[PDB]
Write a protein that binds this DNA or RNA. Structure first.
Lengths: 436, 470, 470, 436
RNA sequence: UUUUUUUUUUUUUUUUUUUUUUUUUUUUUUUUUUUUUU
RNA sequence: UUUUUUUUUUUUUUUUUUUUUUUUUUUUUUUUUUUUUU
């Protein structure tokens, strides 16, 4: 049944929106200031810093960074008669812990935490990707496309584990392998047993993510090495460059700004009654009547900022630019010529130059975002023997194979997925590559 | 942590200063004679000749050069009632070996050796640069700027290897390549294996010195030649003329005269307690209250000699003249019109003409000297995606950059020639003589100790000449 | 070094004695009631029930036995004006967990746990041995002498594993073998892997316990059976009846009553300073000035109770009665005619009949208790040469023992049956009830502290009976 | 030329005999007491403890074992009117160092040191062999025959290295391998370089010791492992059990008691003039007119003691018993039923029971002792491939192949090796095995 | 015609043993009592 | 119909670099001097 899942997610987002309502009540912010992305961003890093129970335990025994008992950051942006000012207001974790507890009807609301942390991962992937660490592990910078969910820490659950990319898992496992190579860390002690356990958990997440049998079997055989040394490093690099084309079935969770939920809940649109979905039309139509204000530099233009915000909201920064333009109805500029900077504001930037303006989120069309792979795969002793079939499959692969047969782009006016329209692009080589 | 490094360097320089104190005690020199650069210079060549264990072993089996059992040179300069006299006093190595051993609390003090030999390399680079060898290998004399640390022999460690210039490594590797071309020296014997090993050690020092990925990769591919012949010669010449603009991150170690440390230690300024640094304010403030005497020819002027000594001390002979003038506060004369000669005195020069006088080392300002590079690389490579991920479920093609996909699992033979040149040339064309470097850093005042607030310099004085040679 | 081990054991027993002091403070018991064995016994079953983390986890998911959340038993015995009364006072585990944590200076003190559980095993072996289980597995009741450390569960560490007898391991392994025979439990799952692991751990404990090479090799070959069926059952029974004479080197850990440590610690005798030992004179001299009170039935006599308590303290219930009498200086009555019962009191016994009195622990002599074996193996195997080397250059054959040369590179299948039996049987026939053991060691006097001069005992008192059971 | 070697060894043994003469002069011992093996044995451990410059340096920095500045042991045995008494007389090293220096005409006489330490190794091999260490390394006790020169430390030179057995080298190399396995000792430091150097020196000694090409090649390939781990352990165990039959050409150096040389030198028999040899008739004829007294327990018999002393002198404890009996002319009892104990006397044994008597060293015949192997060998990727030829050679080997063709046992009266007599034994299976 | 190198604690009570070693959890048991009974 | 584990120091000045690192020796050179000469 799907009604129970819809009711659960509706209750969750209703609690999130009511928490947004109460923070707006408590912060004494104006109507416009309640529609600012920066305030929600800072509040949600406060959120993660309050439920990072592992880091809370680590920092209680580590009183450093000066004035850091329970309070971090808090750069609240406020309006005086047109101008803007930031105040470093410090909030302790514990009261916000109870305000959450009262916001979800006595529950912890860890799932909502997973969705907010994933949405932060989505915005991070949209804005900046780290070839720095990618080459710190020595892997080439030609796989920036598999850094989805890279900023997500381990503390997230299965729902968080679903959206992390294959390359993110590759980076996380190589970190553990290099740590176990630097020092003899795999002893029979509890630490070795626990890192072992985390290793097979991440590995069966990996093998669940893939679709073709060959890569699943080679991941199975990579496990057979009780002592991860150097050979497994190139083995899993080969796994990664095979997943470049033999991509894993990774989900795309559609989370939206902290405000969008709050504005919807404030207006009285109860999500429990009519039901809510995370993959269907829902996050599209909530943005059809949503107003969002944002802060922009004197050199930054808002036109690219709105498109980057739509990237962050729908996690389409790793998709083809042509398709995103089709759903937008307007051309989407690649990151090569974006005359904009990161959404977050640096701690040293002055305030006389900063200017607030609206963001456009309206899209002409809507589409389903399933956790499936291209139809091209369906059309098609050690690790090297399977690398042979990897190579022959790569040779069989073509840049022409059309995927996603039987599905299409839909119009906004339809609600039950009745009749789509088939898109068709013949616009030469505009560039289907967000980076470069 | 940085406290441990500061304590170590403080202990080292304290031992050096105490050795200077004991040499002053043993040589029966006066107070003024203990502030002479020449005495410290001769004593420190004695130092290197005593720890040159490789050369010690080579000369024990090679008893030549007449009276040379254990003693070399030793031209000690002394004052009689205003006049000067040199005595060729010969000191054997071994007693000075034990005096060092007692000076560093039972330790060998090889790091201090590295800093003194680097400081000799700094003074040599400041005074004279060898286009003679630069054209002996056939390389043009336009690259005299990359002869930093040229006089440094191989015996120095990693700290010594950090300050050697890119051109110094180029010269050292071309020497080995020419030796291996003259005779079939790369055999499977131990000599070939050891020269091979030294070769990759010098090469990963090189690739550590650079900053941009293209030159690191081409250095990696130069290694793939198991038999260094003629092609690698022009390959590494191209590497050098690329490093002319794509300069390597080479450190600048701030060593000071043998006396300056001794005078500071004698006064009781313990460096272990308050800590010491080699890059920060430290060598600047020690020179703020340091007195130095030097020997000058009857034709030489002391005004340029003091500036050349400041060059040698702070290894700023390869820097822009305008900046050095700004920190000095006075104009720094380029080597074209320096009416002076080398600091060291020739063995045949007479003594009635020689005159001793003070040197000025005070500077109006101070600045940090990091081992970083300046704005150069621009629009060379931005990686870029190779694959795509389906976010929306739309019936569409999945664009794959196939020809690079094949270059990821296999590949042909791009080569080091007619391939990396395009990138090097493209980057050189993108480079401009206008690009300002070192953003976010500035020149500081002496009165500040914690790097609080700098002042931004600005020169509009036409074309005074930012070129020490020529 | 031995000083560190002595300091560690001294700290451990000091913590144990301080915990005894604090329990005496908290229980509001009198001076006499603090010298009762029963109170310490009940408190120490509370101790084991509080650190039985495996059983704690098993019982949290199994809430049975009525009122059993965290509290078990607790029959505290108290005096009213001469008479005695038991109260079933229930203590939860957790507060005693923290009181331990504060008693060992923030440490868990698991080693002390091992020694107390071993001492409970020692008293259990002294009082009652189970031929019930010995014949439940079908093994004959003739081997009651190898039930040392039988009550010890697996949770003990290596120190606990050292004192468990060979027969205890035989029983534990036969239990696992019968469980694996009843059901197909050796699957490739985690349970099979873990029971496998515990099996080789118990087996290398076994082979470490033995001394002669033949039994070690046959234990090695018993391992080669991946599927323990029926043949291994008689194989290891043969191993056990061979260890009857070819006894294993099993240690004898000298633990003493919960009170004895507490009284010693209360008086201020710090064991860390002067050092402590578990094998030497130490537990002997602490009992030389120790007062112990105990509970005795109206029919039980205290004379045999004191001797049984000395058995339990020094784990000498499996030794020769004559030797124990010699160290005692008084005759030790065997269990055949002991007009006494178990030390522990049944839950239904009335209190008007129960009477408290002192126990005698003074011994005339003292002896070392090493984990060595006695004279047994004789004319079993002397290796011998297999090859020869030509010393003189003489035209002669080179004798090579070829059939063993083929057995050194290859081999058939000798088997564990009809092969090692011959050696075992041969050695048993070579064994005699006359062979004197422990040459070079003797019984010592109390007044000596450094093991200077012993006295050689000599018994010619016919056949008084060197057999505690029967 | 061989005259120079003969002159050198004659000068060396003349110096040794003159040092024996001077020790007899200095110790104030009687004529009988100068013919006791125990006195020479103790004096020669004093000798080795005085030239053990490595141990001297190690003990100067390690002042332990109570009163041990420069003096060790010294249990001198003396006669009072028939009875015997031991005195623990302590001699410092340094004066004996100069007395040596004056005894060899200003030279160190390290070669003589090598021969005395080898002769101690010979007596140790004759008396007791250590299966204790042989099984400490885990090797089976079925190779006690290859423990020749086991007690010899590394300090000996090439002459000492020649007589050490193959099994001795196997034990020494396994010790280093186990030490390098326990800790990461093969670093680029000087210690690793020096242990490396000692390793190839011991290995080319090994490959020089062997005769057939297959084992030399497999020893060459064992070297190719830069990191000696576990596989090389069984590799070299296979090497050892192959050398069981494919024995190495190990020399047998004929050293004699400290006294025998002294008595010969005292009588005026200059060895420089007539020449001396270590392999030929020489040590045989010097024992033909040598008188030796020894100490015997009240239960020990002198008949087996004399034979064991002849074993120690001629290092024939690892040879066939039948051949040794033939040269003796009397039956040689194997160690199984020797009702005797070690030659050296324990420090706690009482003196009222001890009795001194003569030893018989006369032999009916004499034979050359070359460093060659049996004629049976002349009649005949990894380590396992060569193990295959090892197995086939072992199968080709027979316990019947007669060796040493063209050589025979000689009579005493002949001096120039003119005519031998061929021995022939048909005495069933008396037992050609000294142990077991 | 083939050769003196040194790296943190060992060995002569004796002849084949003896020696700085460790908290894992899987479906119902046990203190009426000492060798049976389920 | 698929899920909150914690182990010794990191990160919001910014968008693809920058950062606790080390004594090896092989057949004849060099301080009359500063860019030639052998």
């Amino acid at each position: 049944n799907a009604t129970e899942i819809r009711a659960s997610v509706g209750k969750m987002i209703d609690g999130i929106g009511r928490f947004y309502i109460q923070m707006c009540t408590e912060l004494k912010l104006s109507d416009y200031e309640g529609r600012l992305i920066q305030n929600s961003l800072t509040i949600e890093r406060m959120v993660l810093s309050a439920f990072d129970e592992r880091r809370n335990k680590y920092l209680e025994e580590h009183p450093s960074a000066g004035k850091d008992p329970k309070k971090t950051g808090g750069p609240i942006y406020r309006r005086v008669d047109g101008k803007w000012r930031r105040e470093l207001i410090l909030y302790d974790k514990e009261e916000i812990r109870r305000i959450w507890r009262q916001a979800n009807n006595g529950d912890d609301a860890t799932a909502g935490l997973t969705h907010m942390m994933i949405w932060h991962s989505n915005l991070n992937d949209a804005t900046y990707q780290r070839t720095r660490a990618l080459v710190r592990t020595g892997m080439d910078p030609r796989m920036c496309s598999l850094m989805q969910g890279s900023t997500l820490p381990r503390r997230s659950g299965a729902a968080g584990a679903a959206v992390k990319g294959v390359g993110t898992m590759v980076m996380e496992l190589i970190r553990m392998i290099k740590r176990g190579i630097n020092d003899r860390n795999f002893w029979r002690g509890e630490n070795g047993r626990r890192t072992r356990i985390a290793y097979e958990r991440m590995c069966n997440i990996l093998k669940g993510k893939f679709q073709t049998a060959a890569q699943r079997t080679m991941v199975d055989q990579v496990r057979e090495s009780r002592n991860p040394g150097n050979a497994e490093f190139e083995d899993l690099i080969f796994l990664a460059r095979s997943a470049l084309i033999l991509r894993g079935s990774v989900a795309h969770k559609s989370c939206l700004p902290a405000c969008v939920y709050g504005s919807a809940v404030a207006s009285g649109y109860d999500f429990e009654r009519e039901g809510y979905s995370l993959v269907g039309i829902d996050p599209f139509r909530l943005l059809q009547n949503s107003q969002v204000y944002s802060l922009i530099r004197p050199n930054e233009n808002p036109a690219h900022k709105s498109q980057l915000v739509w990237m962050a909201c729908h996690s389409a920064a790793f998709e083809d630019l042509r398709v995103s333009s089709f759903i937008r109805g307007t051309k989407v500029v690649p990151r090569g010529k974006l005359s904009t900077r990161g959404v977050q504001i640096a701690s040293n930037e002055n305030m006389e130059t900063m200017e607030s303006s609206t963001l456009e989120l309206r899209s002409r069309y809507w589409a389903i975002r399933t956790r499936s792979g291209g139809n091209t795969n369906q059309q098609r002793g050690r690790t090297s023997d399977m690398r042979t079939e990897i190579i022959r499959l790569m040779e069989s692969a073509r840049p022409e194979d059309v995927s996603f047969q039987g599905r299409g782009v839909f119009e906004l006016s339809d609600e039950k997925a009745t009749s789509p329209i088939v898109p068709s692009f013949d616009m030469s080589n505009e560039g289907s590559y967000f980076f470069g």
